[PDB]
Design a protein around this ligand. Structure first.
Ligand SMILES: CCCCCCCCCCCCC/C=C/[C@H](O)[C@H](N)CO
Ligand SMILES: CCCCCCCCCCCCC/C=C/[C@H](O)[C@H](N)CO
Lengths: 283, 245, 46, 245, 283
């Protein structure tokens, strides 16, 4: 050892809690020095005063389960993400995969920062007035980089490699399972920065917040036949979320959304978070 | 007996006599990247003295009607010191931080500051006022450098989320009748083990005055605020010629 | 010239660290490459 | 079976197929400074990857009537790379070196180069021609940078000592009929364990053509010479703001 | 060991040689492959061919000692370094300590780069024609930073701290011993660079090569009395060198010296190193 210079802690570990914690009995107390009612919120720690340190309590054994508050049961519900119509007029549509088009699922997923999950997609398809007509349809998923079909009878519809479903209108709705497919370790709904290098100007200002680890290609449907079908079609896509793991919670949004790609809000009507009242003394 | 504190790292030392406790964000110490999570094959470089030290930024002025300020990390340190050089000559970095904010006043003033570290702070616009424009923030707003920018609508944090529940992030208070400093230790939080320092900004530091500063006329009407930060376990990889941005 | 490919790795040219990777080679097998239904014929009865 | 050689350090690799052996100057490997000889109390910094790599300088042109060139160390590396930055932000450095000179020609040319490393190469003037002026060399002559300067009276090496016994220093030959490269490994040689990099220059590297280059007309009349160097065990101490010179 | 990356030779040693090496006997040799007569001087190593590998030799036991070639016996001889005369006219001289004023000792010490030694000084003093007159003298060594005497009767001659000798002209010559007193670990006779920081210009160009680890202050003599002595004095200083250690040899200088501080030479008459002859074939 010629150089004496070169030779040279987690805080809390998790545990299972099936039920809510019980309440133990207590009595009155008269003493000096010990005080649980006085805290200091300046340190950023929340208070640890229970019920028994302020009043006298009895003994209550509660068996209230905390199962419904887990993240698995909170997210595993199918929600609407897309409405796709074929009046587009040539019997096919190419829809870019973006799951931020409807505000009810966007608010729940933006509660966390990083998320890692597997999905399950379901397609419910009918006419624009709910009417049913026997008709053959084809769905095709196109990964990013793959060629896309430009016509109703292109060579991309041969599906030699692409996953695809053939389903009729009179059938039960189709269901598929999709694994976690990002190049990174988790999806993120917020990306503070620019994706590319080089100079950032007013022509390239729309790049701010677009992370390529979330762009998953496109999605294409068509009527199967080579001619023009005489019916209008409308597709609704529902997505469930399975095997959820989340990280780094955030405040929830209280302003209404404006676009799918940026958190811009309306600058004139800033909505106050609570409903206002008249006086501070009268409820 | 815990109101005094001393932090030393590198060749720098910070002392305080009226201090709150130390906040470790999410209860994790910053550390070097282990081999089970590594993906780069090149051997990383660790300067380990010249970048693990306290760097002092500029000083703002707290008035009676101030809104609030924010700094983007690690954009604040990318043009100063040898850490400004290793982040210009490499492609990947990875480092924790340790934020220390000082603001002192006498026993006859009053006010309260809320310091908070918020990861992935994506800013927004007011969308043209009426809400029909797809506006975007310019480069001078999103990455201000070591000066820092002021806030416009602090009630919505210029990102659509309210101030009222900002304390779910790691945070502390600077109440002018008890203490005069606040300190947070932040580990490295990202989906990838290394990242670029010129195109990605990990977190934002927000200093927002909740209770306004008030005093009687005749006192010292010049209340300054000074931020001091320090990287913890900095590593770098992927050497290439100097590119500033 | 001998028709053999080179056997130089990363560690013989530069200095490297230790990286344990768990990248699977399942998708590159010939069974998973070919077991996908593709179109072979269009037959019409006018 | 020893005519081929490969040197790798950092992220760089030098290969040669017609090479002589490796010269270790005075039989000592370069090493970090032990505690028995240290005098500074501050903990030193070791970048250990970003400065221990091969750096390539400019390329000179060997004519038929050339005199010779010299480079001062480590003045050649003080404006390039991260080693150019750590030598500007610190007060003390300590490092070895590894010099590699390439010059290749075909089997129909002839010539001989004498490479030599000379420590404490103090230049002089011609003292005004007649010898009565106390002249002094300017700053552009004594420290040329990464370009290097040419010699004027190579028989006396511009320092009053003859060329005829320069081989007492560590040295090698580049004879154009056998090999095409020469390589020396130099340890750190100074009276003090650390020194400044902007006011002290440890050694000089001299490339002097003893036998003139000769060929028949029609061959490639453009013979270049390229020098490639690499620090070995670089340490630094005493951090201060950037001062270039 | 969470990181497998962080956990992670002298050539020849000296020996004593009292006598020169002997010569062992040999015979002729006829063979292929083995050849000691062919070398390669390109590698910078000198040849290792002895006498017995080229011709046939007898056995010779020699007892030639190598004592006179040691560095201790080569340097421990007193040489002249200074001539100091008092015609200066006020009975005192202040001479700056610089040991490069006479070329015979300068050439020997410039053979090595770094040197570390203790000295021994001797002062031989008489009139400028060798004549002797009874007279009292005082020598005083002034370290750098100390005040210097400006007159024959200044307050610096009280020698409350300074080492000093009082000696007469009729006496045997004085002798003192001086230890190694540099701030660095060894004296150096060559210093490539500037001593100070900042900008180097044509006004500060004379700083090149002046190392402050060799400037040792000044030296002052005087006649003791407060009046003007009527005799001219001449001092000669001789210095021996003891306990020598040297490092990093150099080529020897073949051009005549010009100044005490820089290696400048005459640029018109460049002296050739060898004495020239007429023809290459006739000695
Ligand atoms: C036959 C199956 C076809 C269905 C293919 C679905 C694969 C695409 C799944 C994407 C998983 C979510 C990836 C990113 C979601 C959001 O759109 C982005 N974060 C937008 O910010
Ligand atoms: C009473 C004793 C008086 C004598 C005092 C003698 C002390 C000075 C000894 C100096 C030792 C050599 C130091 C440097 C020698 C040369 O002058 C410099 N290297 C000049 O280059």
């Amino acid at each position: 050892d010629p150089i004496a210079d070169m030779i040279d802690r987690s805080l809390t570990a998790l545990q299972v809690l099936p039920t809510a914690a019980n309440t133990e009995a207590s009595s009155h107390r008269l003493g000096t020095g010990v005080v649980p009612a006085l805290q200091a919120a300046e340190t950023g720690a929340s208070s640890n005063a229970s019920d028994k340190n302020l009043i006298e309590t009895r003994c209550v054994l509660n068996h209230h389960s905390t199962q419904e508050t887990a993240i698995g049961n909170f997210f595993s519900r199918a929600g609407l993400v897309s409405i796709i119509t074929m009046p587009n007029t040539d019997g096919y549509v190419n829809w870019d995969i973006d799951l931020m088009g409807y505000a009810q699922l966007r608010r729940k997923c933006e509660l966390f920062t990083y998320m890692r999950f597997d999905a399950e997609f379901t397609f419910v398809v009918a006419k624009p007035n709910g009417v049913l007509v026997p008709q053959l349809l084809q769905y095709m998923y196109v990964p990013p980089g793959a060629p896309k079909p430009t016509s109703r009878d292109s060579f991309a519809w041969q599906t030699a490699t692409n996953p695809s479903v053939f389903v009729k209108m009179t059938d039960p709705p189709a269901q598929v399972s999709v694994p976690f497919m990002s190049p990174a370790s988790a999806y993120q709904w917020f990306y503070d920065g620019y994706p590319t290098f080089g100079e950032h100007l007013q022509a390239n200002d729309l790049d701010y917040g677009q992370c390529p680890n979330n762009m998953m290609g496109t999605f294409s449907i068509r009527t199967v036949g080579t001619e023009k079908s005489p019916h209008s079609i409308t597709l609704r896509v529902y997505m469930r979320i399975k095997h959820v793991r989340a990280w780094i919670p955030r405040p929830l949004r209280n302003q209404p959304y404006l676009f799918k790609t940026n958190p811009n809000y309306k600058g004139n009507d800033i909505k106050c978070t609570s409903t206002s009242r008249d006086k501070i003394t009268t409820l | 007996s815990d109101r005094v504190a001393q932090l030393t790292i590198g060749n720098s030392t910070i002392t305080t006599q009226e201090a709150a406790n130390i906040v470790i964000a999410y209860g994790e110490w910053p550390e070097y990247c282990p081999d089970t999570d590594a993906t780069a094959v090149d051997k990383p470089t660790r300067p380990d003295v010249s970048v693990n030290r306290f760097f002092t930024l500029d000083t703002k002025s707290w008035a009676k009607d101030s809104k609030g300020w924010y700094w983007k990390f690690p954009d604040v340190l990318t043009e100063v010191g040898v850490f400004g050089q290793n982040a210009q000559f490499h492609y990947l970095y990875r480092s924790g931080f340790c934020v220390h904010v000082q603001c002192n006043a006498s026993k006859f003033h009053q006010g309260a500051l809320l310091v908070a570290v918020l990861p992935e702070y994506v800013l927004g616009t007011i969308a043209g006022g009426t809400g029909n424009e797809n506006s975007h923030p310019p480069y001078a707003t999103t990455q201000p450098g070591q000066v820092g920018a002021v806030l416009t609508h602090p009630y919505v944090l210029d990102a659509g989320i309210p101030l009222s529940q900002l304390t779910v992030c790691p945070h502390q208070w600077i109440n002018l009748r008890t203490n005069n400093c606040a300190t947070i230790i932040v580990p490295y939080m990202n989906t990838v083990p290394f990242d670029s320092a010129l195109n990605h900004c990990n977190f934002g530091l927000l200093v927002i005055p909740v209770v306004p500063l008030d005093f009687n006329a005749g006192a010292t009407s010049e209340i300054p605020i000074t931020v001091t930060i320090a990287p913890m376990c900095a590593e770098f990889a992927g050497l290439r010629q100097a590119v500033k941005q």
